[PDB]
Design an enzyme around this catalytic site. Structure first.
Site: not given
Lengths: 269, 160, 239, 113, 235, 241, 235, 240, 172
Positions: I9, I42
């Protein structure tokens, strides 16, 4: 009465001798406190105040006194439902427990019949001021006094437990000059009454005036229908004969009053 | 293997692992270690009862998912060994399926599974009969038995 | 006149051998509205009389919920009722979680009594001022119990507590003969008829001050309020 | 907070530095537990209750925690009035090198913090 | 006879020991504060001179931080604890947030600390009252006041201590926008308000001042005498 | 406790009188006579003897359950005078202290050490505002390895001492005077006779074998032993003849 | 047959010969020293009105917060001691934020009132030894319609439809019973509440001595501004 | 003893604690319970006053069970009696757990008596207001009966009686041959004594409650069968 | 009673005179006024930003004023620093506009807290940082800044947000 571990405390005294005996500032503060707790009689309908005692300015033949909310409701429902009554004056008080508040009427058809309705609490240092303001110092020879009061059933003294009694019930106490009779048994021996009704009865007894006091012992001290209805046998006596005319109207007014009592607390469920 | 499929008006949850019912509109599926699964189910039931007593109302699906995520993340340095899928009628007629991880991170989706790629069946909507037929046929096509459909009417106990 | 020194504490014995604070606490149960409970061979029901302070208010809750098979009715103080309800809920939840088996009503009542006895012996505390009626169903059949502020419980079969409960208790004692062989409709009718005796002979048992709780073999605890009590009330006769 | 306390590591508080640290920190509690268990198994419930009541009553009359106390009656009851240990001669607590504010420690003792 | 315990209510709903603490505050020394456009002024009146004394060791104006200062009136020993507690709390919040403290935040903390000591029979309340002025991080002047009960309010100007009713009446009569325009005008207003109750001035007045980004400054007798003479010249 | 302390020069244990007298301790001393019995202990040349009264007024009681002679240890005997519950509680405490001393030091506790420990415990009750003194006095007898027979005594005030012949109860002064008269001017048989004669002369009873109970320790047999009815009757007959 | 003195109201754990814990009744009586607050809920929102009773013009009006913000859709009111209501409102806010953090949902008004009342019913380490001398008045909107609640020093809450707490509680409640209707709009309620307030207060009702707030089913909590008060009073 | 009777840790000028005396006076506010020990067992009997017909038959029981070999009868405050019964059960269970065999009655009585006495020393607690009896039977020990007092003193008895009218009950118990009778006659004698001592004017109605433990029950505490109770009631009524 | 007596990412961001712009290729919406970026675990990111959001809400309720970006970043850094060396892994950028102009901050699990003007993390973010540094300025155009961010993303190889004085919006 101990705040920390090991504090020395003294037991209370039931005779009230704990005040012991013991500056111009002290005199000033005492006078201010005395003026803050002074009984005053005023004419509510315009004007400012009054000069001479209430019964020293009018002729009287019958006096009816109600103390507490239940007796006031009883007289409002059953006696004031007919005829026209004119207010004479009201009393202004101040205690730690207070603040119809001591309002006086009389019949227009018979200006010699008076009715009182005190729903406030009068402290022990304001009883005699109330007596002086209302009665005065030259009592009339021919008068009749009827007093109504409500007390809790836990104040009764019985050989059996206080929860076994069939409350509510009535009791009486009358002066030696009361040539009539009562509709309820007289109060038993080891039972006493104090406060304002006691003051009125003592005054009447000392100054030789006929009088009678009625007590209702109830398990509920709020506005309840049974407590009010417990006063019904008084209506048959000679004291209240030409003052009660219509029973169903009184019952309807009582029902409306019982519908619109008050707001309540949230402690007991 | 655990497979859950959403729908236009119902939620489809099936397994061959165990499936439990939390309320009239929620079904939980667990796998992995047996003792941890039992303890997690007991804790979920206890807290569901506590919430019902406190708020005088049953728990919805999203609230259950949030509470489960908080419970899972409560013990992060000694993680459980479970895999949970939540499926049921959420608010007003929409099937909702939630995915989970052993640490406690969740997201919403439509199709989720737990036995590799489970014949995804591209394209196909997906009425109850067709969805049930596909769910039953996936296992036999793989060739490597309980279905609990949740709808507004209630929860059934279909068997194969 | 000689009571002044011997009734300010719960750890003081009177010269007659009495503790007056316990009796004073017991006097507080008669400050609440009357509630009635009775049972049969299959069901146990609870009937209470709600009371609103004025017209612009909602009547407070007198029937609480403890478990899937246990429910209570309260009369007296409210904070004590809330604390006892919390304790009962915690005990039932803990027992279910650990043993996977419902907590028996007898064990629950014994635990309640043991907990309530403590603040009547030590300093710095006061007795609880609430009386309870507990209805439940378990493997031994329907049950009904009563709890006193003096940490005493009785395994009664038809009892009423609260203000002016003597008439209801008399009616229940008279009609207790025909309670076992009855079903739910006439059981609730008997309960309502018993409760009606408390009110003065000018009011009526309207559908605004009545709460009903029913537990049974295949039926869990259920509370009916407002329009939910209508089916249980049309069959009643006149006074 | 963050100024009244500091230099604390969570990962360095779960693992003790030495095998003897916890045993030395909690010797009196374990000794009392052992004595109470033996007494309760031999005589009954009343003896540990009486002993704990006496300890609680005696321990409740001392100086405020920012001044050193003697603890005479407690030592008489426990029996440590004729024995000297390593807690008496090493690192004297009457001559501590650090001490906090009076009001803060009195408040912390009551548990208001 | 309900005034011998801290946590006991009167039949008419009064807690009397807190009122007695307020009465103890009432007999202190007058302290007056005024919040200006770009300045804040504090001032107290001095008691008996005690010529053989060091005036530095006795002061009733203290600095809590670089943008907050404080004045009090009441018991002298009790204020020295609250001042130190507030001083520590300012730096603790600075570590916590990295932003300078707010006048409202520090006032709320002081009020909570005062309230903590009116909740049990094993300790007695603090018999002091405080005036807190300062500048926020946005450059807005502020002024607050606390009570021994544990309540605080925001003021434009007020006074505490003995003889405060006359000072407050004078401030109400003579506080406006035409006498707050300049720092000199504000200082003259404060000096006149103090002179309304004290004896011959210039020797019984202690006055401080704080501007924006300038820290606390204590005026000296020369400047005080200059201001008093300037007022005297003005008929 | 939150009960505070009563106000007065008496009525509390931690209050000094205008000339420094603690009155609750003296009242606890008065509480010893509530039982109504008397105890006598006499130390011989090589033995010790304890004699106390026995009073069962009810024919529905079990006489085997009424006693005042206890056994703290296999070599230590005790006799208690005062409140029964307090006496039994103090006996239990003494047993616990003896066991603890044995565990901590490795040999049986001496009589003087046991009495000193009991007195040290009792002294604390007279300084705090929570506890109250016990209304009883304890007499201990035993045989020392190198010193011989030993007799000791403790009181509610926390004071202990060793004697040659002491007494406690309701006739303590007369018994003490008789004991001084006897001592100023002893085998095993003479000690028992002396104690029994002292008790009988003081109380004017002319005892029967079922109204007294005796416990003895000797150098040959250092174990505390309670005499039986036959032995007591034999001693009484020998004394009479 | 003598008359003596007996005391039963000097402690929290003492029962009168007829139950009647008197300290709780005295705490309830202590509410009457506050300011009148009126709240009535209708089919399209709940209204809250309260007077300020400013003691001096030098005080900043925007500091006597008699109506606070529990959350985005729940209000509150004030009557009695101010210090206690602050530590109750803090609990309310913390609970309503914790619930959102745990469940991603908005707390029920009944649930938040129960959570608040769970704290004030325990007395007798940090717990007080006396009842709280304050009475609250919750309100707002939820998944149900608008809701109004109540709370008193005894620690027990009851749902309601029209309340009046403060000095003029009896007269305000009588007027509310006389005027209230089953289903009105948010104009008759406003007019009646303002009329009752203007009647009960001794001073004239200007636009600064009162305060008003509303919670409509669509919008969040909103507090009326000075212009809105002026235009409402003029009408 | 006015002025010295507000706490349990205060001594009167003549050396006596008065709160304990008030506690022992409190036990004569309940009904009468008696217990007679015979040649081969122990028989209990209590007089229970009926409060209302609504209570189930078997409520407010005053005859408890500690374990499979010990009975118990109480008098005085009911809650204190229940707490003491729980304590006795705990003590007996713990002794059985540690030592692996049934606890002798004397040690149980000593433990419970000391626990009761422990409440006499401090001002932070209140002395108990109930007195009770214990009984058991073993093949190698025979019958055994004991008494416990709110002051904390215990004794062994042949016949005992506690409650409102203990004096008269003892007066009629003393004229019996306890050592030469079985349970079959002792139950009838106990019923007769209870019927004799009962007062009719003050108390409306009462129901008996009898139980024994002995050889014929194999040392187990049990309730008397209904027929024997009925015939004993008939015998007592006929003799009265 | 007696016993009771005892007891893959890539992200980037930069700021200028007209607010802060953040771009990526996830992004967490902390508040209608504060915007955050996720990088790492996350669950950790979600939990800790949720805790920060609730604490900021409590602060705004208490003080009747919106929190500042520096205070929020410092609070998050302090909260993370307590569990140092426990395996936590996060890298976040806190962007907002409160007072004295917009502010941009960075904070990670180790304890770093740097206030800068341009930030970019994740995989091949060096090319994006280089191209943005080549095309960076202070006074620019909003469309010009959007084009610069798009070019940076394209060179690195879409999620785009803009923060203004009264909240944040999404353009694509």
């Amino acid at each position: 009465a101990a705040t920390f571990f090991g504090e020395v405390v003294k037991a209370p005294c039931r005779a009230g001798t704990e005040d012991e005996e013991e500056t111009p500032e002290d005199r000033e503060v005492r006078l201010q406190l005395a003026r803050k707790r002074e009984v005053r009689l005023l004419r509510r309908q315009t004007k400012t105040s009054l000069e001479v005692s209430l019964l020293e300015k009018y002729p009287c033949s019958k006096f009816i006194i109600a103390i507490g909310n239940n007796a006031v409701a009883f007289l409002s429902s059953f006696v004031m439902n007919s005829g026209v009554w004119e207010e004479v004056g009201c009393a202004k008080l101040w205690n730690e427990w207070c603040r119809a508040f001591c309002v006086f009427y009389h019949l227009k058809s018979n200006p010699s019949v008076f009715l009182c309705q005190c729903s406030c609490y009068v402290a022990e240092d304001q009883q005699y001021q109330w007596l002086e303001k209302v009665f005065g110092s030259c009592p009339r020879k021919n008068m009749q006094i009827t007093i109504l009061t409500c007390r809790h059933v836990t104040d009764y003294k019985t050989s059996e437990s206080t929860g076994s009694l069939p409350s509510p019930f009535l009791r009486a106490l009358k002066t030696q000059n009361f040539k009539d009779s009562a509709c309820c048994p007289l109060l038993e021996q080891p039972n006493i009454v104090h406060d304002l009704p006691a003051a009125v009865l003592s005054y009447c007894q000392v100054w030789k005036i006929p009088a009678i006091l009625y007590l209702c012992y109830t398990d509920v001290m709020k506005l309840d229908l049974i407590t009010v209805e417990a006063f019904k046998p008084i209506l048959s006596t000679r004291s209240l004969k030409g003052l009660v005319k219509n029973i169903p109207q009184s019952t309807e007014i009582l029902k409306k009053l019982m519908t619109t009592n008050e707001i309540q607390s949230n402690i007991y469920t | 293997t655990i497979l859950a499929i959403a729908g236009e008006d119902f939620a489809i949850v099936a397994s061959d692992p165990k499936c439990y019912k939390l309320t009239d509109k929620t079904v939980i599926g667990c796998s992995g270690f047996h003792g941890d699964c039992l303890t997690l189910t007991k804790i979920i039931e206890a807290r569901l009862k506590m919430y019902k007593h406190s708020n005088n109302k049953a728990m919805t699906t999203g609230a259950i998912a949030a509470m489960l995520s908080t419970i899972l993340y409560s013990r992060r340095f000694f993680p459980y060994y479970v895999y949970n899928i939540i499926g049921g009628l959420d608010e007003e007629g929409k099937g909702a399926v939630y995915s989970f991880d052993p640490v406690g991170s969740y997201q919403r989706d439509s199709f989720k599974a737990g036995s590799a790629m489970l014949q995804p069946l591209l394209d196909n909507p997906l009425s109850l009969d067709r969805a049930m037929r596909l769910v039953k046929d996936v296992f036999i096509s793989a060739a490597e038995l309980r279905i609990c459909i949740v709808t507004k009417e209630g929860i059934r106990e279909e068997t194969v | 006149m000689f009571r002044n020194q011997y009734d300010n504490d719960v750890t003081v014995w009177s010269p007659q051998g009495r503790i007056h604070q316990i009796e004073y606490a017991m006097e507080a149960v008669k400050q609440g509205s009357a509630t009635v409970g009775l049972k049969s061979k299959t069901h146990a029901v609870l009937v209470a009389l709600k009371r609103a302070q004025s017209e612009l208010a909602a009547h407070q809750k007198k029937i609480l919920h403890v478990d899937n098979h246990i429910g209570i009715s309260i009369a007296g103080l409210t904070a004590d009722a809330r604390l006892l309800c919390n304790f009962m809920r915690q005990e039932c939840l803990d027992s279910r979680f650990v043993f996977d088996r419902p907590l028996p009503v007898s064990r629950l009542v014994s635990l309640i009594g043991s907990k309530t006895q403590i603040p009547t012996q030590r300093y710095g505390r006061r007795p609880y001022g609430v009386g309870l009626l507990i209805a439940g169903y378990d493997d031994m059949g329907p049950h009904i119990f009563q709890t006193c502020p003096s940490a005493n419980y009785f395994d009664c079969r038809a009892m009423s507590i609260g203000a002016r409960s003597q008439s209801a208790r008399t009616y229940l004692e008279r009609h207790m003969s025909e309670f076992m062989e009855c079903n739910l409709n006439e059981l609730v009718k008997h309960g309502l008829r018993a409760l009606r005796e408390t009110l003065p002979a000018e009011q009526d048992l309207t559908t605004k001050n009545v709460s009903i709780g029913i537990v049974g073999k295949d039926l869990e605890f259920t509370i009916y309020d407002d329009d939910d009590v209508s089916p249980f009330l049309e069959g009643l006769e006149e006074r | 907070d963050l100024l009244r306390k500091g230099f604390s590591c969570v990962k360095n508080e779960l693992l003790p530095s030495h095998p003897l640290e916890l045993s030395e920190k909690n010797f009196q509690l374990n000794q009392d537990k052992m004595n109470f268990s033996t007494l309760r198994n031999i005589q009954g419930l009343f003896a540990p209750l009486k002993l704990q009541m006496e300890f609680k009553a005696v321990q409740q009359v001392q100086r405020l925690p920012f001044l050193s106390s003697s603890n005479l009656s407690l030592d008489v009851l426990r029996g440590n009035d004729e024995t000297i240990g390593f807690e008496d001669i090493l690192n004297d607590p009457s001559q501590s090198e650090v001490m906090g504010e009076p009001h803060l420690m009195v408040e912390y003792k009551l548990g208001l913090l | 006879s309900y005034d011998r315990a801290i946590t006991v209510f009167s039949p008419d709903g009064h807690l009397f020991q807190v009122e007695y603490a307020q009465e103890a505050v009432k007999k202190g020394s007058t302290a007056v504060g005024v919040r200006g456009r770009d300045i804040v002024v504090l001032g107290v009146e001095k008691k008996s001179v005690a010529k053989l004394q060091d005036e530095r060791t006795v002061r009733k104006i203290c600095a809590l931080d670089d943008n907050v200062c404080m004045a009090f009136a009441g018991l002298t020993a009790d204020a020295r604890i609250v001042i130190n507690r507030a001083r520590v709390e300012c730096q603790s919040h600075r570590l916590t947030v990295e932003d300078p403290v707010t006048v409202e935040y520090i006032t709320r903390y002081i009020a909570s600390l005062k309230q903590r000591y009116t909740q049990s029979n094993g300790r007695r309340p603090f018999g002091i009252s405080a005036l807190i002025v300062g500048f926020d991080f946005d450059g807005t002047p502020r002024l607050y006041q606390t009570d021994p009960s544990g309540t605080y309010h925001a003021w434009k100007a007020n006074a505490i201590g003995r003889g405060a009713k006359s000072v407050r009446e004078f401030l109400e009569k003579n506080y406006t926008d035409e006498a707050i325009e300049t720092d000199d005008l504000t200082i003259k207003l404060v000096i006149k308000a103090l002179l309304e109750v004290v004896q011959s001035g210039g020797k019984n007045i202690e006055l401080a001042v704080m501007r924006r980004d300038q820290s606390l400054k204590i005026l000296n007798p020369e400047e005080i005498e200059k201001y008093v003479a300037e007022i005297e010249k003005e008929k | 406790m939150s009960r505070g302390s009563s106000a007065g020069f008496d009525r509390h244990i931690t209050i000094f009188s205008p000339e420094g007298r603690l009155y609750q301790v003296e009242y606890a001393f008065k509480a010893i006579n509530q039982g109504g019995l008397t105890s006598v202990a006499v130390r011989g040349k090589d033995c010790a003897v304890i004699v106390t009264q026995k009073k069962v007024p009810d024919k529905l009681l079990d006489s085997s359950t009424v006693t005042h002679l206890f056994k703290i240890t296999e070599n230590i005997g005790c006799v208690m005078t005062g409140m029964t519950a307090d006496s039994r509680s103090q006996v239990q405490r003494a047993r616990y202290e003896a066991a603890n001393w044995k565990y901590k030091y490795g040999y049986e506790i001496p009589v003087d050490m046991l009495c000193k420990r009991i007195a040290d415990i009792s002294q604390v009750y007279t300084q705090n505002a929570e506890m109250r003194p016990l209304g009883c006095c304890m007499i201990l007898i035993g045989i020392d390895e190198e010193q011989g027979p030993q007799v000791y005594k403790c009181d509610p005030a926390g004071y202990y001492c060793g004697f040659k012949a002491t007494a406690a109860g309701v006739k303590q002064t007369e018994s003490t005077s008789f004991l001084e008269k006897k001592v100023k001017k002893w085998t095993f048989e003479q000690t028992v006779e002396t104690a029994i004669t002292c008790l009988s002369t003081v109380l004017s009873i002319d005892f029967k074998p079922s109204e007294i109970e005796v416990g003895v320790v000797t150098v040959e047999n250092p174990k505390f032993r309670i005499l039986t009815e036959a032995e007591i009757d034999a001693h009484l007959v020998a004394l009479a003849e | 047959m003598f008359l003596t003195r007996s005391e039963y109201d000097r402690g929290v754990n003492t029962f009168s010969p007829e139950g009647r814990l008197f300290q709780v009744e005295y705490a309830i009586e202590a509410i009457k020293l506050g300011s009148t607050a009126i709240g009535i809920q209708t089919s399209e929102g709940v209204c809250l009105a309260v007077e300020k009773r400013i003691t001096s013009p030098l005080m900043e009006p925007s500091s006597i917060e008699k109506i606070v913000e529990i959350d985005a859709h729940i209000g509150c009111a004030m009557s009695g001691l101010i210090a206690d209501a602050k530590t109750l409102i803090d609990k309310a806010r913390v609970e309503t934020q914790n619930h959102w953090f745990t469940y991603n949902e908005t707390m029920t008004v009944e649930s938040v009132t129960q959570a608040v009342s769970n704290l004030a019913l325990q007395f007798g380490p940090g717990a007080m030894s006396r009842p709280f001398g304050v009475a609250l008045l919750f309100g707002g909107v939820d998944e149900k319609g608008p809701q109004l609640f109540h709370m008193d020093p005894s620690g027990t809450f009851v749902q309601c439809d029209a309340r009046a707490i403060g000095s003029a509680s009896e007269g305000a409640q009588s007027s509310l019973q006389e005027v209230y209707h089953k289903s009105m709009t948010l104009k008759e309620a406003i007019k009646s509440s303002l009329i009752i307030l203007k009647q009960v207060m001794e001073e004239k009702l200007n636009a600064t001595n009162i305060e008003l707030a509303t919670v409509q089913p669509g919008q969040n909590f909103h507090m009326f501004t000075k212009e809105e008060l002026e235009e409402v009073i003029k009408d | 003893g006015t002025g010295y009777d507000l706490s349990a840790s205060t001594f009167s000028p003549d050396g006596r604690v008065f709160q304990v005396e008030y506690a022992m006076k409190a036990v004569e506010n309940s009904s009468t319970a008696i217990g007679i020990r015979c040649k081969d067992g122990v028989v209990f009997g209590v007089e229970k006053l009926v409060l209302s017909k609504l209570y189930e038959e078997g409520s407010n029981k005053r005859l408890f069970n500690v374990d499979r070999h010990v009975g118990m009868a109480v008098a005085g405050l009911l809650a204190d009696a229940r707490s003491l019964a729980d304590i006795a059960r705990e003590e007996a269970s713990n002794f059985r757990s540690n030592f692996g065999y049934n606890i002798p009655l004397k040690h149980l009585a000593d433990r419970v008596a000391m626990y009761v006495h422990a409440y006499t020393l401090y001002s932070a607690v209140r002395p108990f207001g109930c007195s009770f009896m214990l009984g058991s039977y073993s093949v190698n020990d025979g019958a055994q009966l004991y008494m416990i007092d709110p002051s904390g003193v215990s004794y062994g008895y042949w016949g005992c009686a506690i409650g409102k009218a203990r004096q008269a009950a003892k007066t009629e118990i003393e004229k019996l041959q306890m050592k030469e009778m079985t349970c079959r006659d002792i139950v009838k004698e106990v019923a007769k004594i209870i019927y004799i001592v009962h007062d009719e004017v003050k108390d409306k109605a009462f129901e008996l409650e009898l139980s024994w433990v002995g050889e014929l029950t194999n040392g187990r505490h049990e309730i008397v069968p209904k027929d024997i109770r009925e015939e004993a009631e008939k015998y007592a009524k006929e003799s009265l | 009673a007696l016993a009771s007596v005892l007891e893959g990412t890539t992200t980037l961001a930069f700021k200028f005179r007209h607010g802060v712009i953040v771009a990526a290729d996830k992004v967490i919406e902390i508040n209608p006024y504060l915007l955050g970026t996720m990088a790492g675990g996350a669950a950790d990111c979600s939990f800790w930003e949720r805790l920060l959001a609730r604490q900021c809400r409590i602060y705004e309720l208490r003080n009747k004023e919106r929190i500042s970006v520096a205070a929020a970043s410092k609070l998050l850094a302090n909260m993370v620093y307590q569990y140092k060396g426990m395996g936590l892994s996060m890298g976040t950028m806190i962007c907002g506009w409160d007072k004295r102009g917009p502010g941009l901050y960075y904070v990670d699990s180790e304890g770093n807290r740097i206030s800068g003007a341009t930030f970019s993390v994740g995989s091949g973010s060096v090319y994006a940082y280089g191209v943005m540094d080549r095309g960076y300025s202070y006074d620019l155009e909003v469309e010009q800044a959007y084009d610069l961010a798009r070019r940076a993303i394209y060179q690195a190889t879409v999620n785009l947000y803009h923060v203004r004085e009264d909240g944040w919006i999404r353009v694509s």
